Amino acid sequence: PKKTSFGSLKDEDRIFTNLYGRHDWRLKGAQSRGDWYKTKEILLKGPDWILGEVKTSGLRGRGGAGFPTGLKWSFMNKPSDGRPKYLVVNADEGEPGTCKDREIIRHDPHKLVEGCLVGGRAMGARAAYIYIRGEFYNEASNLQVAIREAYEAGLIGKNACGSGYDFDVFVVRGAGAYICGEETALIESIEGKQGKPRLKPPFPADVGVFGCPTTVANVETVAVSPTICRRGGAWFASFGRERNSGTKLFNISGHVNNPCTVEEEMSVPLKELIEKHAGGVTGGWDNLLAVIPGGSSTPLIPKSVCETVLMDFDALIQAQTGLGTAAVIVMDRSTDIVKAIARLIEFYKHESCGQCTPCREGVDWMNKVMARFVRGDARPAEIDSLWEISKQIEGHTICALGDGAAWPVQGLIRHFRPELEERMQQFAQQHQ
Amino acid sequence: EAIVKNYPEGHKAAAVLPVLDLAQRQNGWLPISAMNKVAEILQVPPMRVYEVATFYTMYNRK
Amino acid sequence: TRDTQLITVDEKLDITTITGVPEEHIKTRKARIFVPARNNMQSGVNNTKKWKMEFDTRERWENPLMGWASTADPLSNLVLTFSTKEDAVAFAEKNGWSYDVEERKVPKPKSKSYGANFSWNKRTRVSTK
Numbered sequence: 001p002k003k004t005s006f007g008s009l010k011d012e013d014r015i016f017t018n019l020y021g022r023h024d025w026r027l028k029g030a031q032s033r034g035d036w037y038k039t040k041e042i043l044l045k046g047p048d049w050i051l052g053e054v055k056t057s058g059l060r061g062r063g064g065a066g067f068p069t070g071l072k073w074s075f076m077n078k079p080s081d082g083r084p085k086y087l088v089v090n091a092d093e094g095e096p097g098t099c100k101d102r103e104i105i106r107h108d109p110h111k112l113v114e115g116c117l118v119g120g121r122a123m124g125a126r127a128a129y130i131y132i133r134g135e136f137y138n139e140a141s142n143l144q145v146a147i148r149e150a151y152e153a154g155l156i157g158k159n160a161c162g163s164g165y166d167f168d169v170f171v172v173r174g175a176g177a178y179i180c181g182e183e184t185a186l187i188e189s190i191e192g193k194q195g196k197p198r199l200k201p202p203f204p205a206d207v208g209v210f211g212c213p214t215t216v217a218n219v220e221t222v223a224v225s226p227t228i229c230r231r232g233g234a235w236f237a238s239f240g241r242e243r244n245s246g247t248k249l250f251n252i253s254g255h256v257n258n259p260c261t262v263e264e265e266m267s268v269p270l271k272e273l274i275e276k277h278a279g280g281v282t283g284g285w286d287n288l289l290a291v292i293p294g295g296s297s298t299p300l301i302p303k304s305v306c307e308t309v310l311m312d313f314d315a316l317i318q319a320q321t322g323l324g325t326a327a328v329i330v331m332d333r334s335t336d337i338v339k340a341i342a343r344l345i346e347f348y349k350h351e352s353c354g355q356c357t358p359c360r361e362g363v364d365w366m367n368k369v370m371a372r373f374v375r376g377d378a379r380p381a382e383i384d385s386l387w388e389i390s391k392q393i394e395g396h397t398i399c400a401l402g403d404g405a406a407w408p409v410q411g412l413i414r415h416f417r418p419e420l421e422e423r424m425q426q427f428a429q430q431h432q
Numbered sequence: 433e434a435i436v437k438n439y440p441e442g443h444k445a446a447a448v449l450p451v452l453d454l455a456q457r458q459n460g461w462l463p464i465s466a467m468n469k470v471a472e473i474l475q476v477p478p479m480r481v482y483e484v485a486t487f488y489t490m491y492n493r494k
Numbered sequence: 495t496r497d498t499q500l501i502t503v504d505e506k507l508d509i510t511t512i513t514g515v516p517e518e519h520i521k522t523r524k525a526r527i528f529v530p531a532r533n534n535m536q537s538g539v540n541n542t543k544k545w546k547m548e549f550d551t552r553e554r555w556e557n558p559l560m561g562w563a564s565t566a567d568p569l570s571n572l573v574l575t576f577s578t579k580e581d582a583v584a585f586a587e588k589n590g591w592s593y594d595v596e597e598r599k600v601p602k603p604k605s606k607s608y609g610a611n612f613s614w615n616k617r618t619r620v621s622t623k
């Protein structure tokens with residue numbers, strides 16, 4: 001009935017069945033695996049039916065924040081004023097450790113394109129803009145090839161899939177900026193400005209790209225929607241703990257024997273995920289120091305927490321971290337944990353858009369303090385000083401990048417404070 | 433021309449990033465004259481093109 | 495009410511003769527009653543709450559020895575503060591000073607909308623942030 005152990009996902013239940021690119025990624029191969037099947041019927045079912053299926057599946061955002069997708073997409077389910085409506089697909093993929101969206105774009109592009117159509121229909125959108133990071137040039141070209149095939153098969157464009165619905169899919173490339181993954185900064189970049197996030201309100205569903213109603217959705221969130229419609233929300237909701245439903249793409253990187261991308265059920269144990277798919281921690285499980293469970297923006301957790309934690313939104317919130325993008329970064333006991341986190345702060349310092357004070361000045365400040373913590377050139381009173389600084393950034397910035405730079409620092413101080421103080425002790429003795 | 437037609441009329445400024453990137457593919461890098469040419473084609477103030485060129489790290493200004 | 499026997503006096507209150515001010519600095523002076531303008535160099539509004547009374551500026555000249563600014567005007571620094579325009583006028587009248595009143599200038603309420611920065615079809619769309 002209510003299964004209590006999760007994992008062991010079977011291949012028949014996997015959505016991204018060309019994840020590893022061992023089958024044809026073009027239209028013929030995609031149609032052989034079930035893409036673009038009965039898409040006309042799905043569109044004719046209407047926006048309300050599609051949104052109902054998404055709500056029932058319990059799908060949550062796969063971009064890092066995890067808002068319930070069905071409710072989010074329903075903000076667009078409203079009568080049209082004069083303005084057009086748009087779906088923006090977030091393919092920026094910038095979070096360190098996260099490379100799942102790259103695999104979807106280059107190996108299952110037709111899942112994304114069909115997701116744009118189904119999702120766009122549900123929102124009443126006339127077109128989809130797919131924002132892909134500028135470095136993913138070859139992935140963008142693969143996606144552009146797939147879009148052309150869709151136009152030539154009548155699947156998108158005028159009278160899409162013969163449903164009478166007109167839909168366009170545009171691809172817009174970024175130019176090198178992690179902040180452009182932030183949903184409102186992404187919109188500003190499409191409009192030809194610096195990728196600086198907007199304050200909210202207004203929300204994009206009211207005022208978005210070109211000032212029009214807009215929904216920004218992650219590549220993975222969009223790409224699963226046609227399958228959720230074909231196989232039903234109930235089927236998707238049968239995976240994972242309640243309110244943590246579905247399958248999930250996981251990146252396992254760092255100190256593991258076989259770093260890899262894999263699709264696994266939600267709520268799978270973290271330890272099982274590393275051991276079954278990634279070939280275990282380098283040097284064995286007893287060589288594990290810490291894990292960053294959801295990309296650079298999620299607080300690290302120490303080995304003791306990693307023994308029993310489940311990989312889903314609620315489980316990781318209990319561990320004082322978060323699922324994030326589900327990019328698992330493994331660090332074994334040879335890692336210089338202070339230097340590892342100090343490098344992430346240096347990443348956020350280089351990615352801050354500079355718009356708002358607490359992040360423009362605060363993240364740069366935290367970077368300088370962390371650089372001295374790596375060498376030990378500090379005193380223990382500065383640890384609690386660093387903690388308070390991170391709390392002055394968190395919750396005071398325009399966008400969540402400021403939060404994402406404060407959380408890794410807090411995780412380091414929370415779980416490895418003696419390591420910091422030990423290093424300060426070494427530096428004082430050696431210099432004195 | 434095809435880049436500019438991907439956006440609503442009255443919002444040509446949306447084409448600054450892809451057109452600026454095209455100038456760099458033809459030329460290898462972006463001299464100040466290339467930034468001015470892009471601003472002229474899209475009819476946006478040149479300063480709004482300098483901001484984009486210096487914000488995004490893939491543009492080569494040397 | 496009172497046990498003190500009051501009298502009736504319908505005269506306009508005038509205290510010029512009992513203030514000790516020289517004749518020159520009653521009749522030839524012009525008092526200005528105003529609410530100070532906000533110093534445009536700052537956004538704080540706390541110096542625009544009260545009414546002020548000041549007097550007409552008079553000659554300042556350079557001291558032959560040092561070049562300091564000399565004055566013969568005893569009222570050159572006198573600035574009085576009042577809660578209301580009516581209090582300021584009452585004070586000026588009973589002291590016999592001619593005066594001008596300048597009405598307070600309250601900034602008018604503005605319509606501010608962050609969303610207007612991103613208009614689909616209006617000129618309020620900003621080209622930069």
Ligand SMILES: Cc1cc2nc3c(=O)[nH]c(=O)nc-3n(C[C@H](O)[C@H](O)[C@H](O)COP(=O)(O)O)c2cc1C
Pocket residue numbers: 060061062063064065066067069072090091092093094095178179180181182183184216217218219221222399400401404
């Ligand atoms: C600094 C920053 C970077 C982000 N990068 C991405 C990204 O690369 N891809 C993504 O889908 N969401 C990213 N997000 C989250 C988006 O703002 C937004 O929550 C997401 O696109 C919503 O889609 P979803 O509900 O389907 O997850 C980022 C957020 C921040 C603050």
Ligand code: SF4
Pocket residue numbers: 179196197351352353354355356357359360397398399400401402403
């Ligand atoms: S938090 Fe940082 S990245 Fe986000 S708007 Fe403020 S300065 Fe820009």
